[PDB]
C-alpha cells in the first residue's frame, strides 16, 4: 500500500488511459483515432478497464 | 528442560503453573519463537540448531513450514523473586513451567484453535511488523475472545524490516504505532464490562518483539532495566514515561512533551535514541563488513563476545551479537511470568460459560475454588495420535480434583443428562501420560488446571467428552463452536474388496479429529464432509495410510434428483396389458406441495385407525370427510408420499386385485420412469379396472404387471418436472467486503433470504437458499470473492421446485437427465404416445 493521493499521480499517467479496439495501442483519455497508422485512424475506442 | 524428572514437584505447586496458546497467521513466525522458548530448555539440540520446529512430530510439516496441531511444552525458568511479585498472585516458588500448547492459522482449519483455546489459560497472538495485522489473526483470535481470555500480542520479525526495508528512526515507530493501535482497538469489539481490561499497553511490558531467525525479543522492560542499572533510577519511572515525549541531549536533559526546540528545530524520537540506537548502530555497522567499529562498539556495550566468536563475519557476526545481549528467554518468558494468570486465578471466571447447570451444587464451589481434593471430572476435546495405527491420546484438562492413575470414573457423551441408562459408560483408565514436544512422560496424580494426555479412554467418546464421578452433575459445553461443517466429497475404494478397511477407516477418522464430519448419502454411499479444500488435502491425502491402509479414489458427489408431477395428467390414460386381460383408465390429480412438509413429521404417521386421519385430512389439508371411503394403503415402504384413491366404480372390484396392485406400483414410486427414481405428492386415479375371471385365473405374475404402463403413463402425461434440493446456508462476515456475497449468490442461482444486524458491526451473516447442483466449490469461490474473512455454514432444509422442462432435451433439466442418464447407464428418455397410450 501507498498513500492514495500519490496513487492519483501514478495511476493517471500509466494506468487510466484509453485503448484501441483493432490494434491495441494505448491512447490518451480523449481520442477518436488510434494514432498508429496500421489500423487506419479507426473511431473505435474504449476505456482501459478499472484498477484491480 | 533440566526438570527431568522433577516435573511433578512443580505441578502440585499450582501457583507456579501457567500455560498459553500462540495463534497467528500461517507463514508468520509461530514455530521458531517457540523454539527460542524451548531453547531455554535443555531439550533442543543446543549449540545451536535454531530451526527446531517442535510442531514437526510427523512428516509433511518440515517439508512445508506449516502447522496442523502441536503438543505442549515442559520447562522450568530461573529468575529472582524480586522480578516476580509484580503479579497480584501470592505465588511462592521460583521455577515456573510453561506447559505450552498452541494452534495454527489456516481459515480452513480454524475450528482447531477452539479445541486448544477453550482449554488454555492465555492468548498470545503474533503479528508481523511489515504486514501489520493480517486478516485472520484478528478473526481467529476473536474466535474466541468471549471466554474470557487475556490477549497479549507479541509481534515479531523486526529484522526483515530492519535490513531489507531500510527502516529509519521514525517509520518503524509508525509501524509499531499503527500496528499496535490498529490491533488493540479491535480487542474491545466484545470485551466485557469490567474484566475486559485487556487493552494492550506497551509501557506495561506487553508487546515484546524480535526475530525467529536471529532468535531474540524484548519488550520495553529489559531495555529499561539493564539500561536502568545505569543512567538513573528507576525502571517504572523511565519505562513509564517513555515512548513519545522526549528528552533533548545535545546540551541538556530536560524531559518535555513538545516537538519544538527553543530555536525551532525538531527534537528527536523518544524511542529510537533511548532504546534502539544500538540496533541501527549494530546491524547497519555490521552489514557493511567494517572491522573498525565492531570491537570498539563491543566495548560500547557490555564486554565481551566470547572465544572463537570474533572472526566469524558473514551472518555469524550478525547472528550472535543480540544473542549475547539478551535471550528471548529472560525477555518473553519474563513477560509471561509477569503478566499472565495461573489457573487458580483465571479459572474463577472460566466455567460459568462451561458449566451447563445453574450455580448450585458442589461443583459450583469445587470448580470455582478448583479443589484438588474434590470430584474428579474433566473435559477432553482434541485427540492427538501416536506412531502406531492410532491408539490416540485424549488431550484432557482436569478442572477439579487430583486425577490418579488406576482409577474408575464415569464417562458421558456429547448431549447427555444422566437420567437415562443409555450412553453413559462406566470404565477405568489405562495410563496417565504427559507430553512435551514429540515425547511423553508418565505421571501419577495432578491437581486442577493441568492438561494431560489420557491413554486408552479414546474408544468411548466421540470428538468431545466429559467423564464425571458425582452422578448428579451435567455435561460440559460444546459451545456451538465456529467455522466450517461444511463441504462434501464423494470417496470410494477401488477393487471392490476393502470396504471393511474403509468403513473402519473413516469411523476411526471421525474419532481422529473433531473438525471434520462424516455421514451417509441418501443411497447409503460413502461421502466425507470437510472444512474446505486443503484440510481434505492434508488429512484426506493421508487417509491413504496411517488411517485406512488402502488407496482410494475421489469423485464429486451425486445430488439426489427427485421426481414430480403437478398439473392435471392431461388425458385419461389407458393401459392394455401384453396379455389380453385388462384395461386401465385413469386421471391423476397431483396433490399440493404441502404434503412435502406434511408427510414426514409428527402430524401424520399412517396405518392408524381409519377415522383419525380422516379428521386430520378434513380438518387440516382441505380434503373431504369421505376420505375414509377413499384410501386403504399406499407405497413405498410405509412412509410414501401418497395415500391411495377410490375413483373405481364401487360395484365389486379391488378386494381380489389389491394384493397385486398395491404390491405393483412400488416401482414406480421407489424407482421412476422419466429420470429413474421416486416421486412425491403424486396421486393416480384409476377410474376403471377389469378382472374377467376369478381368483384361479388371476395371480402373482399376472397381476403385478397391472400398472405396467398405467401410472407410468398418466404420471408422465401432464408436464412432469424433476425436483431438486436447495440448501439453507448462512454466511457470516463484517460489512467491509459483503459486496461479493450477494453477487456470487446471484451468479450461482442463489436466493437471498434476509440480512441481520448485531450489537456492533461484525458477523453480519446472511440466510440464503442455495441449490445443491451448484453448491460444491461455493465455499471456495466465496473465499475468492471475499479474500478470507467470510465463514459459511450449510444445512439441509427442504425440497424446492424446478421448472426447466426435463421431458424435452433442450434446457438445464434436459441436460442433467441427459448426462445423468448417460451415467445412469440406460439410453434416451422414451418418446412414447404409442407406447403407454395404446389406443383402445
Amino acid at each position: 500500500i501507498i498513500e492514495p493521493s500519490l496513487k492519483a499521480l501514478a495511476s493517471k499517467y500509466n494506468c487510466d488511459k484509453s485503448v484501441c479496439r483493432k490494434c491495441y495501442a494505448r491512447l490518451p483519455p480523449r481520442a477518436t483515432n488510434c494514432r498508429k497508422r496500421k489500423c487506419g485512424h479507426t473511431n473505435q475506442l474504449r476505456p482501459k478497464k478499472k484498477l484491480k | 528442560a533440566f526438570t527431568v524428572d522433577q516435573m511433578r514437584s512443580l505441578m502440585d505447586k499450582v501457583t507456579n503453573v501457567r500455560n498459553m496458546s500462540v495463534i497467528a497467521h500461517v507463514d508468520h513466525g509461530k514455530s521458531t519463537l517457540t523454539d527460542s522458548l524451548v531453547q531455554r530448555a535443555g531439550i533442543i539440540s543446543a549449540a545451536k540448531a535454531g530451526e527446531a520446529r517442535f510442531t514437526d512430530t510427523r512428516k509433511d510439516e518440515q517439508e512445508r513450514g506449516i502447522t496442523i496441531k502441536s503438543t505442549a511444552i515442559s520447562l522450568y525458568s530461573e529468575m529472582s523473586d524480586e522480578d516476580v511479585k509484580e503479579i497480584k498472585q501470592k505465588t511462592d516458588g521460583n521455577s515456573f513451567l510453561i506447559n505450552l500448547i498452541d494452534s495454527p492459522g489456516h481459515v480452513d482449519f480454524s475450528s482447531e484453535v477452539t479445541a486448544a483455546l477453550r482449554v488454555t489459560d492465555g492468548a498470545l497472538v503474533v503479528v508481523d511488523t511489515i504486514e501489520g495485522v493480517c486478516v485472520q489473526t484478528e478473526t481467529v483470535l476473536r474466535q474466541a475472545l468471549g471466554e474470557r481470555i487475556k490477549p497479549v500480542v507479541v509481534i515479531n520479525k523486526v529484522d526483515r524490516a530492519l535490513l531489507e526495508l531500510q527502516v529509519s528512526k521514525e517509520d518503524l515507530y509508525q509501524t509499531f504505532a499503527r500496528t499496535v493501535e490498529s490491533v488493540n482497538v479491535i480487542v474491545s469489539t466484545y470485551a466485557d464490562e469490567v474484566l475486559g481490561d485487556v487493552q494492550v499497553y506497551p509501557a506495561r511490558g506487553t508487546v515484546a518483539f524480535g526475530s525467529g531467525l536471529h532468535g531474540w525479543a524484548f519488550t520495553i522492560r529489559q531495555f529499561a532495566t539493564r539500561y536502568a542499572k545505569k543512567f538513573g533510577v528507576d525502571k517504572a519511572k523511565m519505562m513509564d514515561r517513555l515512548w513519545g515525549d522526549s528528552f533533548f541531549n545535545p546540551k541538556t536533559k530536560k524531559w518535555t512533551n513538545k516537538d519544538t526546540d527553543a530555536e525551532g528545530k525538531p527534537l528527536e524520537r523518544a524511542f529510537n535514541m533511548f532504546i534502539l540506537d544500538p540496533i541501527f548502530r549494530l546491524f547497519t555497522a555490521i552489514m557493511n563488513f567494517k572491522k573498525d567499529e565492531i570491537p570498539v562498539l563491543l566495548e560500547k556495550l557490555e564486554i565481551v563476545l566470547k572465544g572463537d566468536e570474533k572472526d566469524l563475519e558473514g551472518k555469524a557476526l550478525l547472528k550472535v551479537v543480540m544473542r549475547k545481549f539478551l535471550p528471548a528467554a529472560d525477555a518473553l518468558l519474563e513477560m509471561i511470568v509477569l503478566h499472565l494468570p495461573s489457573p487458580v486465578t483465571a479459572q474463577a471466571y472460566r466455567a460459568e460459560q462451561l458449566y451447563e447447570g445453574p450455580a448450585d451444587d458442589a461443583n459450583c464451589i469445587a470448580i470455582k475454588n478448583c479443589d484438588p481434593k474434590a470430584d474428579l471430572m474433566l473435559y477432553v476435546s482434541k485427540m492427538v495420535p501416536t506412531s502406531d495405527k492410532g491408539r490416540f491420546y485424549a488431550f484432557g484438562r482436569v478442572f477439579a480434583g487430583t486425577v490418579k492413575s488406576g482409577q474408575k470414573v464415569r464417562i458421558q457423551g456429547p448431549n447427555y443428562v444422566p437420567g437415562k441408562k443409555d450412553d453413559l459408560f462406566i470404565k477405568a483408565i489405562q495410563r496417565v501420560v504427559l507430553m512435551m514436544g514429540r515425547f511423553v512422560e508418565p505421571i501419577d496424580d495432578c491437581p486442577a488446571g493441568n492438561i494431560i494426555g489420557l491413554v486408552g479412554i479414546d474408544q468411548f467418546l466421540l470428538k468431545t467428552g466429559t467423564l464425571t464421578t458425582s452422578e448428579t452433575a451435567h455435561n460440559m459445553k460444546v459451545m456451538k463452536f465456529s467455522v466450517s461443517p461444511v463441504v462434501q466429497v464423494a470417496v470410494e475404494v477401488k477393487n471392490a474388496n476393502d470396504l471393511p478397511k474403509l468403513v473402519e477407516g473413516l469411523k476411526r477418522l471421525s474419532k481422529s479429529d473433531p473438525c471434520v464430519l462424516t455421514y451417509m448419502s441418501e443411497s447409503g454411499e460413502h461421502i466425507v464432509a470437510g472444512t474446505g479444500e486443503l484440510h481434505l488435502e492434508i488429512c484426506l491425502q493421508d487417509l491413504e495410510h496411517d488411517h485406512a491402509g488402502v488407496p482410494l479414489k475421489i469423485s464429486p458427489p451425486v445430488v439426489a434428483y427427485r421426481e414430480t408431477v403437478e398439473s392435471e395428467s392431461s388425458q385419461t390414460a389407458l393401459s392394455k396389458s401384453p396379455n389380453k386381460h385388462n384395461r386401465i383408465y385413469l386421471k391423476a390429480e397431483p396433490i399440493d406441495e404441502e404434503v412435502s412438509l406434511a408427510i414426514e413429521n409428527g402430524i401424520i404417521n399412517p396405518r392408524d385407525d381409519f377415522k383419525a386421519r380422516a379428521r386430520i385430512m378434513a380438518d387440516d389439508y382441505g380434503w373431504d370427510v369421505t376420505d375414509a371411503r377413499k384410501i386403504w394403503c399406499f407405497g413405498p415402504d410405509g412412509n410414501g408420499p401418497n395415500l391411495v384413491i377410490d375413483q373405481t366404480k364401487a360395484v365389486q372390484y379391488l378386494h381380489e386385485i389389491k394384493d397385486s396392485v398395491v404390491a405393483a406400483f412400488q416401482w414406480a414410486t421407489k424407482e421412476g420412469p422419466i429420470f429413474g427414481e421416486e416421486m412425491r405428492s403424486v396421486r393416480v386415479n384409476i377410474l376403471d379396472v377389469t378382472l374377467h375371471a376369478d381368483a384361479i385365473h388371476r395371480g402373482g405374475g399376472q397381476i403385478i404387471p397391472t400398472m405396467r404402463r398405467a401410472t407410468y403413463a398418466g404420471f408422465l402425461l401432464a408436464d412432469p418436472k424433476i425436483q431438486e434440493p436447495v440448501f439453507l446456508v448462512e454466511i457470516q462476515c463484517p460489512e467491509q467486503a459483503v459486496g461479493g456475497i450477494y453477487s456470487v449468490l446471484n451468479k450461482k442461482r442463489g436466493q437471498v433470504v434476509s440480512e441481520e444486524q448485531r450489537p456492533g458491526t461484525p458477523l453480519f451473516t446472511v440466510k440464503a437458499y442455495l441449490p445443491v447442483n451448484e453448491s460444491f466449490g461455493f465455499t471456495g469461490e466465496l473465499r475468492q470473492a471475499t479474500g478470507g474473512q467470510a465463514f459459511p455454514q450449510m444445512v439441509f432444509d427442504h425440497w424446492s421446485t424446478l421448472g426447466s422442462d426435463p421431458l424435452d432435451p433442450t434446457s438445464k433439466a434436459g441436460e442433467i437427465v441427459l448426462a445423468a442418464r448417460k451415467r445412469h447407464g440406460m439410453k434416451e428418455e422414451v418418446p412414447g404416445w404409442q407406447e403407454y397410450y395404446d389406443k383402445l
Binding site: E3, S5 | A177, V185
Partner: protein, 189 residues
C-alpha cells in the same frame, strides 16, 4: 434568441420602478440551503443570477427613468445577480451572510486556509478508528469513546483538501467548502 427574450422581460419587469439595486458576484455557492434562503426569502426579492448579458444589462437602460443603469458594462466578469427591496437593507445583511452551511469539498478540491486540530471529544462508537493510517494520528479508545492522544496536523498551506486524510476531516465538523453570499456592490435608487 427569442428564448433569451424571456431573459429580457424577467429583467425588464424588475428594473422598472422599485427602490434598491444590489448585485452579488457568487461564483462558488452551495445551492440547496441558500435557496432555502429563497424560501425564507420567499417573495422578498427574486434573484436574477442570470446570463452573460453583462454588456446588455447596462446598454439596455435606454429608458433612462433612472439614468444610473450604466454601471456594469465595464464589469464583463463576475457572476452578477439582482435583488431589490423598498426596505432598509441593514437588517437583511445580518442573515444573508449567516448562510454558512457547508459540506466536504469535491473529494480533493481546493482549501480555504490551514486548520489546526486539538484533542476534542465527539462521542461515538469505534467506527473509522482502524482507518486512520493515511494521516496517521495517535488516537485511543477509552470508556467506549474516541479520545485523541496527540495533535497531528491535517492540511498545509500550498496544498489543498484531499481524499485520503480529508475525507474524515468532517468527522471533526469544520466548514471549508462554502464560499457564502459575498457583498460586491450596494446602492439605493
Amino acid at each position: 434568441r427569442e428564448k433569451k427574450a424571456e431573459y429580457f422581460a424577467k429583467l425588464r419587469e424588475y428594473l422598472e420602478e422599485y427602490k434598491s439595486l444590489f448585485v452579488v458576484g457568487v461564483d462558488n455557492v452551495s445551492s440547496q440551503q441558500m435557496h432555502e434562503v429563497r424560501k425564507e426569502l420567499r417573495g422578498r426579492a427574486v434573484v436574477l443570477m442570470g446570463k452573460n448579458t453583462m454588456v446588455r444589462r447596462a446598454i439596455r437602460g435606454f429608458l433612462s427613468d433612472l439614468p444610473d443603469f450604466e454601471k456594469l458594462l465595464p464589469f464583463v466578469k463576475g457572476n452578477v445577480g439582482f435583488v431589490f427591496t423598498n426596505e432598509p437593507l441593514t437588517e437583511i445583511k445580518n442573515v444573508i451572510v449567516s448562510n454558512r452551511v457547508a459540506a466536504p469539498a469535491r473529494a480533493g478540491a481546493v482549501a480555504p486556509e490551514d486548520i489546526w486540530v486539538r484533542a476534542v471529544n465527539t462521542g461515538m462508537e469505534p467506527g473509522k478508528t482502524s482507518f486512520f493510517q493515511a494521516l496517521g494520528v495517535p488516537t485511543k479508545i477509552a470508556r467506549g469513546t474516541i479520545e485523541i492522544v496527540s495533535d497531528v496536523k491535517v492540511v498545509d498551506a500550498g496544498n489543498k483538501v484531499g481524499q485520503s486524510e480529508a475525507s474524515l476531516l468532517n468527522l471533526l465538523n469544520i466548514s471549508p467548502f462554502t464560499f457564502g453570499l459575498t457583498v460586491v456592490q450596494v446602492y439605493d435608487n
